[PDB]
């Protein structure tokens, strides 16, 4: 039995646990955060992402909890709506709860005898060549443990990644992009959806935009993507309401003015990083999946779905190369990296037609 340390019990980490569990590895997952089953909110799941769940027999489980989006609904500056179908049926996407997907994936990974969950454990440091990691439980005693394979599934700020990268003469490397994001809610109207549920709703503007995905509880979660330069200018409730009157006129009625002003100032806008690694593996000891390998901002694509495909492709290599990691890893890097727009920046011009 070969020993695997999966760093990160998020979306990709939990998925990968299931894939590896099928291959009779000894898998220990280490999640810094607490078990969410005791203790953004939406995502669009794609056809490609589905395939990965199906490969571990979770699809129908997760699909039943999801609301299908079969077209875009565009909200123009004037507050008018227009529908745009997806070309192919395979472009349909599914709105799913982030939290509950993570819950389901974790339970699925525990259904396996050879999987043990280690919550409230934060990788402080690791050694790739040495196959050793340094974790930290709540008891707060740095204990070091060895392993055969380290799977960096520890998200956009991967600690595993920080150890696999070299560190040049003068680090002229910006981490964050100039855009930030903020979540709002369109609540139900009369115990039902305040707009058309089976659409991805989009308020495209040039340098900023909002999107809305439906929830099972008959609300929509909004996400507003804006340069910090713009967020900076919205200091008061009056500023916010003014901004929304001017750029998202139909949104205020849907969200409600009070609710908007409350939720807008719960937190600063959340920053985002755009990174890609030259390689997703070290030797035969360490591989990166999900945002650890490629942190994809939503403007340029679909991070979860990409990470889920990471798992699928990795699993296909394992079949292909009979669990030989010396081969799977390097080939994984080579085959994934070359896998490269609903949320692009544009003005939407209303025509007479
Ligand atoms: C606003 C927004 C909207 C998005 N919408 C979509 C969408 O619609 N569709 C889509 O496909 N993608 C979407 N994405 C991308 C998607 O959220 C990510 O790409 C995806 O969650 C990556 O999954 P992951 O497992 O790699 O990382 P994560 O989900 O971030 O999980 C990483 C885990 O590692 C843990 N961890 C971190 N450091 C340590 C450490 N040192 N020790 C131990 N554990 C650690 C964290 O606690 C976390 O549980 C969106 C992203 C953003 C920011």
């Amino acid at each position: 039995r070969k020993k695997v340390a999966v760093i990160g019990g998020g979306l990709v980490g939990s998925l990968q646990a299931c894939f590896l569990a099928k291959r009779n590895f000894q898998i220990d997952v280490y999640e810094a955060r607490e078990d969410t089953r005791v203790a953004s909110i939406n995502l669009a799941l794609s056809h490609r992402g589905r395939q990965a769940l199906k490969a571990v027999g979770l699809e129908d489980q997760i699909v039943s909890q999801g609301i299908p989006m079969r077209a875009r609904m565009i909200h123009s500056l004037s507050g008018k709506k227009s529908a745009i179908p997806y070309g192919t049926k395979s472009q349909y996407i599914l709105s799913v709860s982030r939290e509950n997907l993570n819950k389901d994936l974790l339970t699925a990974a525990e259904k396996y005898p050879n999987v043990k969950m280690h919550f409230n454990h934060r990788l402080l440091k690791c050694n790739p060549e040495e196959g050793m990691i340094t974790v930290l439980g709540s008891d707060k005693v740095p204990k070091d443990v060895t392993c055969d394979l380290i799977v960096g599934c520890d998200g956009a700020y991967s600690t595993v990644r920080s150890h696999l990268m070299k560190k040049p003469r003068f680090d002229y490397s910006q981490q964050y992009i100039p855009h930030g994001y903020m979540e709002l809610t369109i609540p139900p109207k009369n115990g039902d959806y305040a707009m058309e549920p089976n659409y991805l709703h989009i308020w495209p503007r040039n340098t900023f935009m909002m999107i809305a995905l439906p929830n099972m509880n008959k609300s929509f979660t909004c996400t507003l993507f804006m340069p910090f330069e713009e967020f900076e200018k919205l200091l008061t409730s009056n500023d916010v309401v003014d901004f929304f009157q001017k750029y998202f006129p139909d949104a205020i009625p849907l969200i409600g003015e009070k609710l908007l002003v409350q939720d807008f100032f719960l937190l600063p806008a959340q920053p985002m990083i755009s990174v890609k690694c030259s390689s997703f593996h070290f030797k035969s000891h360490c591989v990166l999946l999900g945002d650890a390998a490629h942190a994809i901002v939503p403007f340029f694509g679909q991070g979860m779905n990409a990470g889920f495909e990471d798992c699928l492709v990795f699993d296909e290599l394992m079949d292909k190369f009979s669990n030989d990691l010396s081969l799977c890893l390097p080939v994984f890097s080579r085959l994934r990296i070359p896998d490269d727009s609903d949320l692009s920046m544009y003005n939407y011009i209303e025509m007479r037609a």
Side-chain angles (χ1 to χ4, degrees), residues 74-82 347-353:
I74 305 307
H75 300 235
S76 69
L77 272 157
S78 75
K80 260 57 180 139
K81 291 184 296 200
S82 58
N347 304 293
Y348 188 68
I349 315 308
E350 288 182 290
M351 301 280 110
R352 297 150 60 77

Side-chain angles (χ1 to χ4, degrees), residues 59-288:
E59 176 174 23
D60 304 355
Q61 217 273 253
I62 285 147
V63 165
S64 55
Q65 303 309 300
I67 295 94
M69 300 174 287
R70 311 182 224 276
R72 306 93 135 184
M73 192 69 83
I74 305 307
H75 300 235
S76 69
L77 272 157
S78 75
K80 260 57 180 139
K81 291 184 296 200
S82 58
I84 307 179
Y86 287 114
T88 169
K89 197 184 162 189
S90 78
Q91 273 177 279
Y92 290 16
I93 33 174
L94 190 71
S95 184
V96 297
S97 155
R98 167 168 243 123
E99 191 192 315
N100 291 332
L101 179 56
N102 212 158
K103 283 186 179 164
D104 290 358
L105 288 170
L106 285 163
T107 63
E110 282 188 331
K111 290 210 84 199
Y112 283 104
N114 36 336
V115 179
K116 303 177 180 166
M117 294 294 170
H118 305 252
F119 296 100
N120 296 276
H121 282 92
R122 178 212 195 288
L123 176 75
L124 208 136
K125 155 176 75 198
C126 73
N127 210 145
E129 280 273 21
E130 308 290 294
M132 189 89 102
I133 56 168
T134 325
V135 313
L136 186 73
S138 44
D139 69 283
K140 194 119 155 181
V141 178
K143 76 198 156 152
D144 305 32
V145 285
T146 189
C147 52
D148 304 313
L149 178 60
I150 305 163
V151 193
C153 285
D154 53 342
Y157 307 96
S158 166
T159 319
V160 178
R161 188 212 291 143
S162 56
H163 277 265
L164 295 192
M165 67 173 80
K166 55 221 273 185
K167 311 217 153 188
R169 268 287 179 192
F170 291 93
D171 182 42
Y172 291 114
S173 201
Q174 283 171 46
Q175 231 201 150
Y176 292 108
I177 57 159
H179 276 69
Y181 77 86
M182 169 191 293
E183 296 233 283
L184 308 166
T185 300
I186 289 165
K189 192 162 183 166
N190 314 329
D192 208 6
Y193 289 108
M195 22 177 57
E196 306 82 339
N198 304 109
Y199 290 79
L200 174 68
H201 299 252
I202 310 187
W203 290 256
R205 315 290 176 254
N206 198 10
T207 55
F208 59 95
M209 68 196 311
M210 193 162 64
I211 57 169
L213 288 70
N215 292 123
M216 273 302 319
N217 75 171
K218 313 296 201 214
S219 65
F220 297 75
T221 302
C222 293
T223 305
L224 175 62
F225 296 95
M226 226 143 66
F228 278 99
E229 185 151 78
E230 290 284 341
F231 278 112
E232 252 193 329
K233 297 171 186 189
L234 304 183
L235 309 167
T236 69
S237 66
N238 278 14
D239 293 340
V240 164
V241 163
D242 203 64
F243 186 82
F244 267 69
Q245 277 172 173
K246 203 195 170 170
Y247 293 116
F248 307 121
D250 63 316
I252 289 158
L254 273 352
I255 301 162
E257 207 166 286
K258 252 91 165 180
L259 214 222
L260 171 63
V261 169
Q262 166 183 111
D263 285 354
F264 185 94
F265 288 113
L266 288 179
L267 288 164
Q270 256 287 148
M272 287 178 291
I273 48 184
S274 192
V275 301
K276 197 169 107 203
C277 299
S278 66
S279 177
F280 298 168
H281 85 273
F282 193 71
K283 306 241 174 163
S284 58
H285 327 294
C286 192
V287 61
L288 301 174

Side-chain angles (χ1 to χ4, degrees), residues 7-13 30-33 40 42-44 98 121-123 153-155 159 181 223 225 289-292 296 298 302-305:
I7 315 307
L11 266 19
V12 175
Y30 297 80
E31 170 60 48
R33 294 187 298 150
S40 77
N42 265 134
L43 286 104
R98 167 168 243 123
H121 282 92
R122 178 212 195 288
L123 176 75
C153 285
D154 53 342
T159 319
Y181 77 86
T223 305
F225 296 95
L289 305 99
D291 281 0
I296 292 152
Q302 308 248 237
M304 169 188 65
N305 289 313

